[PDB]
Amino acid sequence: GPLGSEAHLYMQVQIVAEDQFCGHQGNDMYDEEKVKYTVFKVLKNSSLAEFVQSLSQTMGFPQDQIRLWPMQARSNGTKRPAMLDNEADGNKTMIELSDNENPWTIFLETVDPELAASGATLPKFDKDHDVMLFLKMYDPKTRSLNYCGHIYTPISCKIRDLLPVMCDRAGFIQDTSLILYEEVKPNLTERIQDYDVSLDKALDELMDGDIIVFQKDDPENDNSELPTAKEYFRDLYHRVDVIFCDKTIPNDPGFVVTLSNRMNYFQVAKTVAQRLNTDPMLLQFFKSQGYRDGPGNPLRHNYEGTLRDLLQFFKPRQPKKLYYQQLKMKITDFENRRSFKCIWLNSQFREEEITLYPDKHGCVRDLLEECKKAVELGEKASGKLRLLEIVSYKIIGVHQEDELLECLSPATSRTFRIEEIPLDQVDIDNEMLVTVAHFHKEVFGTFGIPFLLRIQGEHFREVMKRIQSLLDIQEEFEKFKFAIVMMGRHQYINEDEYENLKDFEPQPGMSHPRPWLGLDHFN
């Protein structure tokens, strides 16, 4: 194996009986992915007469009461039965007749099995003057199609004379006034405007396997969501069933919404929001892909495409799915959130990487409150926040809350830090806030965590043990060395005699950068 040497000699012929046409709700006779066939494996080079007897035997029919109407495609994409003459074209072989279709599907017509016991012959059909039409009846109250079989008619027959047949097969009195459409193709259902015309003239390109759709003309109809068959099919044509899965709870079965191709975002949203009981603005949707099954870029409200546009990357036989999430705030605010990566300095003096989402048009205060929402602030402490800007492990700034977040540096050397203010740094007057920074170095080899301090002049040895309880370094804090650092210069200060002032400030002669206390030691 697997494939056998003589396999190429063979083609496949899918026979489809008229019962498959019943209850079909779409265009043409049946849906291709539901229809039940009788499949034959026939020899490519074999003949029609051969296949017909073989068929006859298998199906349980005499040959003089079946006729085969090959299902043939048309330019407009529809598929309908077509005439094939079982006698003229019988000498010919199956691939020839098939036009190399593999598989080939054929409509097997049969005698009404009631008149079949009687031994009834299938009616004579003139290839040139008769047509085989198919009838469908459209019922407004139930939005459904009900198959009405087929008829042989001369093409000279005035349409008016088909009315009684149509009524009798639907289930109507003869007085019943009908509306007749031709189903031409999907999204084209054409009302026959005038019944006192021959079929030949009534319908353009009249041929076998053409479809007349008829309905009752009763004022009752106007109550239906879809009064005419024309509306039924136009609705059908744009109908699409979409699966909405939540992008936050994976292995979500999701659910199926029936929507329309034509709908816009507000309409799609309004519809999904309903059977979620939540607001459409409390929903965010995601642009979609197709086959690498997964939520793409957040589709955004200002969006103005149609649902057809959102599913344009889908294969037709592939089931349709869109991802969404549920929102805690208005949709229109969620999009104006800014991703803001910074450092949270807890009250254990240790650094945590946190990403906060304040509003784009927000200010520093706004960022601070977003931070307080994510952190415990150490009991009985101050519980007040400030934002620092840090570079090379040195604090270069403290930003006012009223300052717009927009004004802050995108730069990646800049590191923003949020911390709560120690209790002894909120009231101030004979006392100052100074920047402190660790180091090895001459003056630029800075490292570790900088911080703000508590500089009037007094005991320096006490300042040191305060920094000691804060750095919480057990004693390797001996062999530290401490320095004031200003513009182009740094004077040291031993741990013995020093008592300071406001040496820290620009000696009169530019306002920034300010000096800093620096802590000299290893790693």
Side-chain angles (χ1 to χ4, degrees), residues 185-217 219 221-246 248-250:
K185 72 197 187 181
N187 204 16
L188 182 59
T189 313
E190 284 181 318
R191 194 179 115 239
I192 302 170
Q193 299 188 11
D194 185 358
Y195 301 153
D196 287 291
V197 183
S198 56
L199 282 176
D200 188 50
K201 295 192 343 194
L203 310 188
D204 301 323
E205 291 172 55
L206 173 71
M207 47 180 307
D208 310 296
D210 273 337
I211 288 166
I212 290 177
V213 172
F214 64 91
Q215 70 176 53
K216 284 203 274 189
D217 183 357
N221 293 331
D222 288 305
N223 296 302
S224 175
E225 304 181 332
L226 299 163
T228 64
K230 187 168 180 49
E231 286 176 274
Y232 172 77
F233 278 117
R234 148 180 316 138
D235 173 89
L236 173 66
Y237 179 68
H238 295 277
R239 190 184 290 162
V240 47
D241 297 318
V242 175
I243 308 163
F244 292 82
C245 318
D246 197 312
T248 55
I249 50 179

Side-chain angles (χ1 to χ4, degrees), residues 105-111 113 116-123 125-126 128-139:
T105 291
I106 308 182
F107 169 52
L108 169 74
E109 174 191 5
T110 270
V111 285
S118 312
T121 170
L122 211 52
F125 179 95
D126 183 90
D128 297 332
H129 297 327
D130 297 324
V131 75
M132 178 182 53
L133 293 188
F134 290 77
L135 310 159
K136 296 186 199 166
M137 184 273 298
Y138 171 67
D139 166 36

Side-chain angles (χ1 to χ4, degrees), residues 15 100 113 167 174 194 221 234 244 312 412 450 457 523:
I15 298 295
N100 279 288
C167 284
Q174 299 279 270
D194 185 358
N221 293 331
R234 148 180 316 138
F244 292 82
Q312 79 166 5
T412 68
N523 63 343

Side-chain angles (χ1 to χ4, degrees), residues 355-359 361-375 377-379 381-420:
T355 303
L356 303 162
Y357 297 79
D359 193 75
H361 317 327
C363 60
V364 168
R365 186 180 52 252
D366 296 315
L367 171 70
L368 296 178
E369 260 135 45
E370 223 72 20
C371 190
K372 181 192 307 177
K373 288 196 285 193
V375 295
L377 298 192
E379 51 184 4
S382 62
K384 296 94 175 180
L385 302 196
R386 61 181 176 210
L387 177 70
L388 308 196
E389 187 168 349
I390 302 176
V391 176
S392 293
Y393 316 83
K394 294 149 59 197
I395 296 167
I396 79 189
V398 183
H399 298 248
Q400 298 111 349
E401 313 182 359
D402 56 305
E403 165 155 10
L404 286 187
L405 291 172
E406 174 185 15
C407 294
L408 301 179
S409 194
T412 68
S413 42
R414 319 287 179 100
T415 276
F416 290 84
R417 195 173 73 194
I418 305 173
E419 62 204 29
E420 54 187 312

Side-chain angles (χ1 to χ4, degrees), residues 17-23:
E18 187 155 10
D19 65 278
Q20 293 302 287
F21 298 169
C22 293

Side-chain angles (χ1 to χ4, degrees), residues 467 470 475 477:
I467 295 182
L470 182 151
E475 211 134 344
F477 181 67

Side-chain angles (χ1 to χ4, degrees), residues 22-35 37-50:
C22 293
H24 173 41
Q25 297 302 289
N27 295 103
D28 301 345
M29 272 67 47
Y30 53 82
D31 176 288
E32 180 74 33
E33 307 170 347
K34 288 179 174 187
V35 52
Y37 291 127
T38 311
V39 180
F40 292 75
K41 218 183 202 66
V42 320
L43 274 175
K44 270 177 190 178
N45 63 295
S46 77
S47 78
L48 180 61
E50 266 169 321

